[model samples]
Target chain A: AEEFPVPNGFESAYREVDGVKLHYVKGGQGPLVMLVHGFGQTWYEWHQLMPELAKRFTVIAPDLPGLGQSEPPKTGYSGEQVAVYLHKLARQFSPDRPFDLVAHSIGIWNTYPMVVKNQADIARLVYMEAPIPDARIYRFPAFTAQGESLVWHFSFFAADDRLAETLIAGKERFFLEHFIKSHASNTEVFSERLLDLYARSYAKPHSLNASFEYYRALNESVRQNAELAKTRLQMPTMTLAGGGHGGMGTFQLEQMKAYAEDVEGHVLPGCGHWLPEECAAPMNRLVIDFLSRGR
Target chain B: AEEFPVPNGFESAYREVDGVKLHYVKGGQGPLVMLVHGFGQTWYEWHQLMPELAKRFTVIAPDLPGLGQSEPPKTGYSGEQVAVYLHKLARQFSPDRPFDLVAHSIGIWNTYPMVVKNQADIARLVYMEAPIPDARIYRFPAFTAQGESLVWHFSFFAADDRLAETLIAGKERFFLEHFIKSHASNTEVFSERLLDLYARSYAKPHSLNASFEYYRALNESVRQNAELAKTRLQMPTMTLAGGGHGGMGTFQLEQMKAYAEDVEGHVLPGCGHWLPEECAAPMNRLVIDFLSRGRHH
Candidate 1:
């Protein structure tokens, strides 16, 4: 599929875990490092920096269950459950050794539980753009021009009775393009081809519904996250956020600090919510440097 | 037009106020009783209760500026500004006598400023369903399914750069139908013809855009309301709220008490946000009973 292109040195692979088929791209040959993508995107969001990171460490970018080419999970869509699937995938590649992890957007939502539950299994963590969902989401204000443009989807997507999915059904391009372009600091970063690919992926049967599942389970994610927060992440963590519209910016850093002990933070100068795609070069260098520490 | 049928005794009237053509329905021949409708509706929404009130008082239900048959405002869309226009409309009718007032939804947002600014002009007040927009709107939570279905439009409508207007331009019925039906406890109340009438009215040139202007000006309204709240409403106030989904219930009453001195409240059972339409019988009797306290009904 032209929408999905496997770069040279990267090969597509799949594994069936706990009745769900998980698809991922694996490249390079060294210690394992997994990349988890966020909402409105698949693992392909990491395609830009995959080869560069591949030179130093083995890179595994997985399509979160029911997103991209991966099959939907049989039952629940709670972030904690997603954390288990991704953890099993990581442990499969690097048994007996702690594997480094990087995640973005809701990928952070899914994987944060892994680090919280079994920090011993993960070596280091790099999460960007989105804050891990918790009770604090309740504190978000109801009216702000900034919030309306950026975070309205939190309510729109989490809406019950398939409201968001029903509205954006055939108008995938319209909704995604508007949503993606509006949040970016640099509009030029998203080509028509890139936007089309994402819209196409989400437009697939059950893909759109599954995407909203992550948000629908937010109340569950909040409960799990609150319980998980009791045990702080001991792993070295790096938080990155965008500096433009929709970007969590330093807020993401400040938020992560409450849940993790050893946390380094940065607000990419001119990036939006899509940090890995918008500021790939800076993100790659930062991740390589941070993960390569003590190597 | 068949969509906007004037009741037997009521007559359609227009008055030019401050460069805006204000459209309203007028009936009866006594002290003025002004009826202000909310979003997704116009003076036509009060068609059910206009005649009953007209028996004792001269009733005037105006299609708020830029809504229904009325012309859009020339510049800003602040609630305080809208309040001034409605107050002017009432004064032209009753002149020396204090007029009674009934407002719904965003109608409350626009007219609450009137009660705040000139309590003496308003003899009695009946506000239903919606709270007066204030800084307290900030305290509302971001999550919860109820907030999503009922109040998501607060942000969706308040969005900048004409976003809400653009998305809803060609899909008026689709958007309005979902919005109206979802917030109501009695879905059977909104017939296809009635929904279509509202959709057609909004689909008119600049009408949809004008409707959102009220929401777009909410931040300004909040500031004005906060300033207005410094002066409590002295008139006897009656608050009616729906007890079902999207209804503010006692909250509307509680909120009004903070802004007004003399206030009575009720929660209409099985009713939703569309209190006037869904619970018309109870609302009419309650409003008449309250407003006619000093007189014989």
Candidate 2:
């Protein structure tokens, strides 16, 4: 028998979804909740909050088909395909009840379509500083303001998969320089041990390509979401922004309100894009408050 | 002509030594002074004080044979051969004058035989916490306070070129982890920029093997030094040890005393094995002062 190396504190359960073995980490035994992380990040991002969230709800965090520890397939998995896969996963976990969905950044864009289309029975949606498509809400001109459209050129067009992989793999200093200096509130917060984890994950073959594909899927997902806009989410939806005064957080809140009919919004102060590391306590509180509000 | 990229704020001179074009960074304009760095390090290790020393003396810091930016030969560039190669470099740079030589760690070991053989007209020698050959004055106890070998087994073994190369190239991370952690004062000092330098150097093809050969040459040099010990260095020599209260620095000072006459020794307070980085200002002062003193009195 071949020994499979699982990540620390993660129990893997694989299910055949769309002819692919989707691996997910499952914990707790109560009302079901799905936690989805963003592009260029893995399930490890939820390190601080997952165990705490699991205590209250059956928190199921998957590698999202192509990213992290999940095995890569020949064909690129679209955001719609990913949502359908999660839709199948939700049925396996909770056959009797609709689960609460918690997604951050681009994960919300992928999961929201499923909620709108009635593919999965999502009781409530908590979008954590996520980018939801809405063209009208503009305090400042698009691209001038730092949000989805501003960084879209770099994320969507400029970065090639090969160059991204080589830069990520060969020079980890360059990666951490971008990750810490650009994102973190204080650069000192990113220790060498933490950087090493990200380096090791990126060094693995196909990891960078899989990561970049999320951006590629964003174009398709935007087109799919335009179609999905006709259908409204029956469930209650909430958006919370990290009020570290970043433009992305400010814009995400505005976009969420326009997309969903039943929506509430809040801005979390003293937090950055790295909400899990910077403001886990307050972020987790907002998530719990939103999920519990349905009762 | 293919352009060779020199590091910022330094002028580089390329010369074909023993069929391999050696790229060396040369600065200053007085009596020549050559700085040689040890294993897993480039000429950049002397970054703290090279420019300062260059102001008074013509400082020539080269990536040692088969390491750093220097090109490696097909064969026959052992520590002894490298010593001769560096002597050639010293002669080419200084021409008609005797140069002051400054070396750190294993660099001292390589430069030792050159000075002994009078290959370079060396006026004075400054060895900064360099590994001196095992002699009567120095001893490596098998057990430290932690009951571990104070000296690594590989440090004492016979030079195996093949094995050395294999070990170095095969496990690059091992070399990088050891080099960064060992040299750094604490974990915090092992910055991402520094580790990347070590990793990039190791990632180069045959870089690990080239580094292992540097270690392999230690025992070979030790054996060669025993034979050459009959020939005493007539030149003025100075030895500086890091006074970080460790056996390595203490043993180095004692070993230097046994090898040369007219040897002036100073222990650098609050310094480690890496006296260049750990205690550069005082160490450099001692070198320039000792070199200023006229030859064998």
Candidate 3:
């Protein structure tokens, strides 16, 4: 079912992080660089920037657990739990030094716990199109306005595993199609080809369970993140989000500042949440510049 | 639609009240009885009772303005304004006397001011599957787990016309069906036939606007009714409501007492807002018994 191959020197490999083996693409020389893909995406999401990123430093992009070609974790998905695994992976790659990190969506969340626990493991960080969970101080009925009810996805995805799986079984196409298409600001860019990769991966059995587990871990992640935020990651950091409607780069930026000293953020125009693929040029450029700061 | 003919001598007609043209089905001979329908419905909602009611009295059931064939009014919809029209209709046939009223849902409000203005203008009233003037005395969110927000329907119908209509335009079937099904205790009763009728009726031109007016008028009615608090309605009154989830039958009974001297109410189990269609048998019996009391027939 594979339609594409890892570009040039980016080799396909697997590493046992926290006793759970994960599929990944690793290659490149010099300082180590790591990429974590968001939900509904595989390591392939970095395809647009992988070649360019590999040009600067050795880059590693792994398929998140329960996502692409990786085994589903035995324990329910949690940012801190996954972070424990990633910390192992990063340490294994550069046993003697900290590496550069770029994470998007739920990936940013999982990496967050790991980064906070081992701040020295990450040299500099970039969070793309990721909003901190339970970050808002004021709201309830905010989910009931014009086209806002869609955000109530937590209620469905975070429901009991058995219940969510039953409703989601054969209708994965409809559900994924509706979400991807509607969530895109540039509908023109998030076309049928992009949808196929998402639809195919989630249609997998392990893929389905991970979807619910990720959301189920959300509240726990909220508490875990709040606890993680208490300790500041003094390394240089940047959070950028898509600039269209419902974009949260600004909010993501503001929240990150509370946790660190050298933090910068931006919300760019003409794209939505699919930041890596949606705006690959500026994304790669911004990430490369930010990652090289104190190294 | 054509198979259900008016029972016996009932005739379909239109009346001009308060410069508004109202489509109505009038018949029966003795005392005057009227039925006002809830939102998303027309006078046709009373078809099941038309013949039976015609057996006891002259039944005048008119489609509320903004629904069915009635001319949508330009002024803001209100119970008092609707009551004024009802008062005109009452005086048209009997200039010196009052008319017995049987209002369901929103119809109860349109007839409210008429009853309040001249207690003698209404002999007795039966409010079925209806509850408004939100009977709760004080409604702040007393618990941290709860919220004090208007129901979505209230916002949807009371919302500005342009936005409401745009949101509700083509999805009338889904919206109306969801409401009727979710509210019903015995969902089996709200069959495809009943849903189809409602869907078609509300999809008519100007129907959405009229639908919103009922709730918009509710706010106006509450403020306006407050002014008439001093003159409690001396006439006999009854409030009946759905006994299923979110039912307000008892609350209606409690709130009606604030507006009337003699009041009683009941909640028919296994029923929702569509009382006429859901609990027709008991509804007819209770109403017949209630309307007959202290009457000189």
Candidate 4:
């Protein structure tokens, strides 16, 4: 439990929402801010940003269901369902007020539906890395050096017959370490201790398959997202993307602007896909500045 | 050497065409019928059809360069170049008469250009399993179960950074065996001996990468095929596709019809991607009937 440290005054706890047990870290006391992490990471990815945000706001960072310490959902892995689960968790903390939402990578996939469904419940939203699955995903090229370098795993992990899990069974550390470092501009930020925790987390029984469920559900997820996109998000939104080789850069920002009313975007130069870890300082400053408006 | 034997009267030989050394098995003595095999196989895949065809025509089956017992092309792996190399090989035997050509899988990739560049040199042709690289291939989906079952290796083998080779290094036998059987409807035809031979064939140094070079060159190959495709092939072309789960069915037939002037197609029912072996009796009979058209009762 203590292998990875928590921010001072922060404590870890678990709560069940709709049969999915969610583990989160909570501290500070003011305006509520909920942090959600993406694939290959847990709430620990926000350890650096948590304390800073907690200083000005009571922060709650929960492991996305079926990832980290959270229990797999008894229902489905749709982004819409995961959004409802996390929304309930956020609503429990502030019954009478709106809260800010922050997410990264597939975390954005799980949480983007929140602003669309509960627009009045959320004050400000920050999303990064990649966009939610939509019809645009169907147009991605199957064969190209660029595709192989960036999104090869989308097909590989989503492939049937369990080939991905089988091929990567004994090579969890090798695969996870390579995957994380390869997608990061600031490689040193992902320390061995952290990689070990992430690797061992996925290596657990049924853990790897559970994580891939999101990708497997992409066909349906895209359909769900298309329907959700019918209503544009009313909340003020911000997008931060990595601009380097492995990052989606302003691609996510451009896509987010298409679906949100009031949106501002920034591209972190020289950063890769892992924005929270690699470009945490600038991300934190931008997040605070945007949320602190009207304070 | 006899682990995988050739058909009777067929003997092994190597000839240098252009800058590439191609090893082939030749026998019989009549009209020329040149056979080219595809990826994961050698001249051996044509052995079953060789003896029967040798009875009426001169039969020669050559492994595509850099695949099995053949040297990598000193120049490049483009379909146009490999086609020229094999065309020269076919011309050296007859030099004056047009010959029949049959190719499979990447075999079609290496030799389809011959008809475009030297239409009169090829009297008749049979191609199967897949069509040549074209703009259509660029439109194939990236994340479908259909793609994963049949053509997942297309992207996997074409990936850079040597990851395919690294992951498949010591697991060549496991990987190759699984791949071969998974693609066939008539699985029993691919005996353990043949699978072992195919696995060991790809296990050689630089051999796996050499095989992948064909896929790596697909971007340019598609361009070359598009240019060559401007002139429709005049030769009587026939396409035989396995019409089962793993097969492309009549997909290649429809594609071939788009690029050929005289095209007739057949889909082998209940067959998989390995057309020659899976549906050999019918494929052989169809080959002879199609090639035998207007000749010898």
Highest lDDT: give the candidate number. 1
Task: Give per-model CA RMSD.
Answer: 3.0, 19.9, 9.0, 4.2
lDDT of 2 by residue, B1-297 (tens): 212334456687778876877767877778888889876677767766667776677788887777777787545445567787788888888888898888886687778888888834988888876565544312333222221232333331222324234334444555565544544343454457766676677557755566666655555556677888787777778888776633255666677777788787887666766666556678777776676665321
DockQ-wise, the better of 1 and 2 is 1
Q: If ranked by DockQ, best first, what sequence of candidates would result?
A: 1, 4, 3, 2
Chain B TM-score list for all models? 0.96, 0.84, 0.89, 0.95
Inter-residue clash pairs, candidate 2 = B165-B209
Ranking by lDDT: 1, 4, 3, 2
lDDT score at residue B111, model 4, on the 0-100 scale: 93
lDDT for model 2, on a 0 to 1 scale? 0.63
Candidate 3 C-alpha lDDT tens digits along A1-295 = 3424678877888888766888888887878888998876788888878787676788888888877877777565878887777778877888998898899888987788888888877888888876555444223231232323223445445544244465556666656766665555666766777787678788897798887788777777777887778788898888898887545546678777787798888888876778776777887788877776644
* Candidate 4 residue-wise lDDT, B1-297, digit = tens: 642577778889889998788888999888788988887778888888888888788888887788788888887888987888899899988687889999888889899888789988889989888768887776555665333435656676776556567667777777776677667788888888778898888777667878888877776788899889999999999999998766888788889988888999999888988878888899899898888782321
Give candidate 4's TM-score. Answer: 0.82
What is the lDDT for A255 in model 2?
75
Chain A TM per candidate, in order of listing: 0.97, 0.84, 0.93, 0.95
* Model 4, span A1-295: residue lDDT tens: 6325678899999998997888899998898999888888889889998888887898999988887788887777878878888999999998899999989888888887877888899999888887777866655556653334455577766766665676677777777877787688888988888799888888765678777887877677777888889999888889998987578876888788779889999999989999888988888898888878724
Best by TM-score: 1
Of the native A-B interface contacts, what share survives in model 3? 0.00
Candidate 1 residue spans exceeding 4 A from truth: A145-150, A191-193, A226-230, A268-270, B145-150, B169-171, B226-230, B294-297
The superposed Cα distance between candidate 4 and the true structure at residue B160, in angstroms, equals 2.0
